[PDB]
Every structure is written in C-alpha cells, then in structure tokens.
Amino acid sequence: SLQVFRKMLTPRIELSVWKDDLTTHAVDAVVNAANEDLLHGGGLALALVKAGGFEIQEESKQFVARYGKVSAGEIAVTGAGRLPCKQIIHAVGPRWMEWDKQGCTGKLQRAIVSILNYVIYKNTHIKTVAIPALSSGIFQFPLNLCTKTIVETIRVSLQGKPMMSNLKEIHLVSNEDPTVAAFKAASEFILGKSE
Numbered sequence: 537s538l539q540v541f542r543k544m545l546t547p548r549i550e551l552s553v554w555k556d557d558l559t560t561h562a563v564d565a566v567v568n569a570a571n572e573d574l575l576h577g578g579g580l581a582l583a584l585v586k587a588g589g590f591e592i593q594e595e596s597k598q599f600v601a602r603y604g605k606v607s608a609g610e611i612a613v614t615g616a617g618r619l620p621c622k623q624i625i626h627a628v629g630p631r632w633m634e635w636d637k638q639g640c641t642g643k644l645q646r647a648i649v650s651i652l653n654y655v656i657y658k659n660t661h662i663k664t665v666a667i668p669a670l671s672s673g674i675f676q677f678p679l680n681l682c683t684k685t686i687v688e689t690i691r692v693s694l695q696g697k698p699m700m701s702n703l704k705e706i707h708l709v710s711n712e713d714p715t716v717a718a719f720k721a722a723s724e725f726i727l728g729k730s731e
Contacts, residue, residue, distance in 0.1 A: 537561065541720045541730045545695045545706075551687075551727065553719040554666075554709045559587035561709055562620040563664040567651055569671065570596075570626040572605040574612060579674050584624065588617035592624065599626075609646030611654060621666075623659070625651055629671030632678070641685055644671055648689040656701045666707040669715045679715060683708075683722040691726055 537560075541553035558566055558580060569580045574596035576585045585592050595614040599606075606612045608630040616624050627650070630643035647670055655662040667686065671677035690706065708719040724730070 540716060541723045543723065543727050543729075543731050545691065545727070546698055548701070549694060549699070549703055549706065551690060551706050551723065552708070553716060553723055554707050555711065555713070555716045556709050557711045558666060558668060558709055559583050560620060561666050561707070563666045563705075563707060564621060564662045565623045565625050565655060565659075565665045566616065566619060566621045567665065567667045567670070568624050568626045569668055569673070569675075570606065570612070570628050572607065572628055574600050574606060574626055580668055581626075584619060585617075588619035588624075590617075591615065592617045592619075596626065609643040609650065611647070611650045613654070613659075623662075625654060625665070627651055627670055629675055629677065632671060632676040637681075640671075640677065641681065644677065644682065644685045645689045648686055649693060652690070652693050656699060656703050660702050663702055664705040664707065665703070666709045669708075669710055669719065672715060679718045680722075683715070683718040684726065687719070687722040687726045695727070 537556040599612045606628045612626045627647045630640040655665050669682050672682045710716050
C-alpha cells in the first residue's frame with residue numbers, strides 16, 4: 537500500500553489516493569466494478585471473488601434473482617466473504633461509447649452518487665470506502681475522463697459541506713500505476729495540493 541494524495545474535503549471527510557491491491561485493502565466497504573448480471577467473470581470483479589470466496593458470486597446471483605439486473609449507475613450490496621472489508625458495493629459503470637460520451641459520463645456520475653448516498657445516509661456504520669476507476673478497464677472508459685468525473689462528482693457532492701456522518705475516508709485505489717497517477721492528477725487539479 538502507498539498513499540500518494542490526501543485532502544480534507546470537509547472537517548471530517550478525507551479523500552485519499554492509493555497504490556494498492558483492492559483484494560488486500562482494508563476498508564469497511566470495497567466498490568466492485570460489476571456488470572448488470574453481477575457475473576464476476578473478469579477484471580477486479582473476478583479478483584474479488586478469487587480472493588474473497590465463491591459465496592460472493594452466490595450472493596450476487598441471489599441478488600439478481602430477487603431484484604433483476606443492476607442498471608448502469610446503480611448499485612447492489614453483498615457480503616465481502618473473506619475479503620478485508622465488511623461489504624462489497626457492486627457498482628455498474630457504463631460501457632464506454634464514443635457515440636454517447638455525455639450519457640456514459642452521466643452514468644458514471646450516477647454510480648458515484650449512489651455510492652456516496654449509500655455510505656453516508658443508508659448504511660451509517662461505514663467509516664471508510666474504497667472506489668476503483670469504474671469503467672476504465674474492460675469497459676474502456678478513458679482514464680483521464682474517468683478519474684476526473686469521479687473526483688469532480690465527489691467534490692460537488694461533499695466539498696465544503698459539513699455533513700453529519702460516520703463517513704471519514706474515501707480511498708481512490710488502483711494497483712496500476714497509470715490509474716494511480718490519473719487519480720492523483722485529477723485530485724490535484726480539482727481539489728488542490730495534497731495535505
């Protein structure tokens with residue numbers, strides 16, 4: 537693990553950027569990059585199941601059998617199996633479509649807003665959450681726009697705004713150096729100098 541950026545968005549909430557493996561990253565809730573069927577067949581999703589256990593996949597299928605497919609911009613929550621976290625927030629980011637960049641950006645923004653609402657107002661026992669560069673890998677969302685949308689959505693949602701929450705830390709995390717650099721640059725341009 538390595539923290540490369542940190543800043544107080546509010547007096548209580550810190551945003552940080554990390555180089556780390558999300559399967560070894562200790563937080564209350566890890567955000568998975570899922571598809572609408574919650575079938576964890578590649579990428580981060582597959583890693584989380586391999587690290588945390590097949591029960592994650594089992595519960596994911598149970599979720600979909602009860603509530604249907606998760607739309608882009610929406611979330612489903614399961615147990616974390618044997619991951620170093622207490623819950624997995626399965627966020628469905630959009631597949632990138634050059635033909636609808638605004639649409640895709642909107643769904644990404646919507647995913648981040650759902651995550652924030654979840655950890656702030658819904659499950660109030662979450663102190664720390666880790667979010668990847670949703671949609672950037674298999675879903676081909678350009679890394680610069682991805683990380684900027686995430687960081688800008690968080691700032692507009694919370695920066696300067698004293699919330700009454702148990703939320704203390706939002707980690708933007710990747711085990712890949714280009715993504716870590718992109719999160720850091722995005723953070724410095726949108727939030728200013730690291731503390």
